[PDB]
Every structure is written in structure tokens, then in C-alpha cells.
Amino acid sequence: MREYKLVVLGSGGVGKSALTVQFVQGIFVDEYDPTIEDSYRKQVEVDCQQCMLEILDTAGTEQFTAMRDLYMKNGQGFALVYSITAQSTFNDLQDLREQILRVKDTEDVPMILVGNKCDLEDERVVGKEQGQNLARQWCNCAFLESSAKSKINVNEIFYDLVRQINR
Amino acid sequence: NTIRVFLPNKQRTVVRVRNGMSLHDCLMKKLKVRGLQPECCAVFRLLHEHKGKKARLDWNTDAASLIGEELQVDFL
Numbered sequence A: 001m002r003e004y005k006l007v008v009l010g011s012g013g014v015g016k017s018a019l020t021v022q023f024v025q026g027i028f029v030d031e032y033d034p035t036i037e038d039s040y041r042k043q044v045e046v047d048c049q050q051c052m053l054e055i056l057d058t059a060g061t062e063q064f065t066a067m068r069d070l071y072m073k074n075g076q077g078f079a080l081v082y083s084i085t086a087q088s089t090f091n092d093l094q095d096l097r098e099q100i101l102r103v104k105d106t107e108d109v110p111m112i113l114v115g116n117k118c119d120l121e122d123e124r125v126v127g128k129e130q131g132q133n134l135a136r137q138w139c140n141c142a143f144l145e146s147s148a149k150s151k152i153n154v155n156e157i158f159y160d161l162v163r164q165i166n167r
Numbered sequence B: 001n002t003i004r005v006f007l008p009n010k011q012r013t014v015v016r017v018r019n020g021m022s023l024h025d026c027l028m029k030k031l032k033v034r035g036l037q038p039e040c041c042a043v044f045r046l047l048h049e050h051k052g053k054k055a056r057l058d059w060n061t062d063a064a065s066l067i068g069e070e071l072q073v074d075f076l
């Protein structure tokens, strides 16, 4: 069956691990344990079809920065995650988009922009339309707001990357 | 002060070690988030001198003693 190498990218504390663990294991990770390296695998039914997903959950460190193009070169699909409760993590993503297109020698790279923590509406400091604007700017990039805690749009992140890959 | 650990179903993690933790202490969160029970698993150090031969370790091994070692966890 087809394997899908996915890569989860974004600043510290935005929910990259919580999203990935919710997806693969169906549990919510409550406490913040900064990631050094972690990979996960999951076989999934996409549309109606067998897909092996390997998900690389990345650190926000100098070491990841020094390896990043390697993760990009090898990855087939990218979730770029920020938190709606933390402005700097949204401003940090632009760089990541342009680099992926640089490394892949194309603008048609499977990608999704993910505003996570949508259950924390009272703490929101980045607008929904504000994320939709950034995605639009990125050549009509896929966009979701998600919650690893409420399980809103979690599977959809990975299924949309697999559907993107398939096209 | 980290240890890299290869895991079942072609997964891997790297864990930080604080002096005093056992191997099981340094790994327990990474095993829980992947549903891995250490009582159903063996853990091995990879012997890079001996073509990677696996040497089995006690889950209670001192983790500081293993810094820089690369380990593998397999099901029993």
C-alpha cells in the first residue's frame, strides 16, 4: 500500500505533538513536553483507500533548522501549524512556506495551513479570516482551524494532505 | 544529554536525560503516547562495534550511564 511521508512544522507550543498524538493515538496530551525528535506511523483509510502515514513531528530548535531542508526534501506533505492564541507563532510561518517551495523546486507542494487551539476562542489573538488571508496569499493553500483538545478537524489535516498527494 | 531510541512500527524518538532518571523514567511518556507497555517490551543497546548486535538492558538501567547510546525497543 502507498506510504505517505508527512511533516508537521511550526513554532514551539502550538500543538504539533498534540495534533499528531490525537490523530494517531486518540489521546490528548495535556502538558507541554518540548519535542526533540519523534516519528509516528498510522495506516489510514483515505476516501476509501489504504495509506501508510509516517508523520514526523519536529522540534523548534537550531538543530531542526540545520536539518530542515532534509525533512522538506524527504517529506511529501506539510502541515504548517500555528496557535490562534500566540501571534509570534503565526508570524513565524511565512519563512517555512517559501523554504518548502525552494527545496521542492515547485509551487505545487501538498501543504495545509493549520490554526490550532480553536477551542480557546476567548484567548484568540489571530483572526480566522487573518489565517484564511495568509493561505489565500500562498496560492489558494488549504486552510483549517483545528483543536487537538476538542478533536475538531484533526483527522482532516492529514487526510487533506494524503488527498493532495494523490492528485 | 539525550538518548535516541528506535521503536516498533518503524517509529523513533529522542529523549532528554536528567541525572538520576532510569531508562524507564526517561522513556515513559514516549512509550505511553504510542501505547507501548514496557512490561510487554524488551529494550536493547545497539553495539556499533559488533555490527549493531543488540544487547538487552534492564528497564531500570541508570539513564545517565546510557547517554549517547542508541537503543531499540522490541515486543516480547
Ligand SMILES: Nc1nc2c(ncn2[C@@H]2O[C@H](COP(=O)(O)OP(=O)(O)O)[C@@H](O)[C@H]2O)c(=O)[nH]1
Residues within 6 Å of the ligand: A010, A011, A012, A013, A014, A015, A016, A017, A018, A019, A029, A030, A031, A032, A033, A034, A035, A116, A117, A118, A119, A120, A146, A147, A148, A149, A150
Ligand atoms: N486548549 C488546547 N490546548 C492545546 C491544543 N493543542 C495543544 N495544546 C496544548 O498546548 C501545549 C503545547 O502543545 P504541544 O503539542 O507540546 O506543542 P508543540 O511544541 O507544537 O509540539 C500543550 O500543553 C498542549 O496541551 C489545543 O488544540 N487546545
Ligand SMILES: [Ca+2]
Residues within 6 Å of the ligand: B068, B069, B070
Ligand atoms: Ca552512540
Ligand SMILES: [Mg+2]
Residues within 6 Å of the ligand: A016, A017, A018, A033, A034, A035, A057, A058
Ligand atoms: Mg512537540
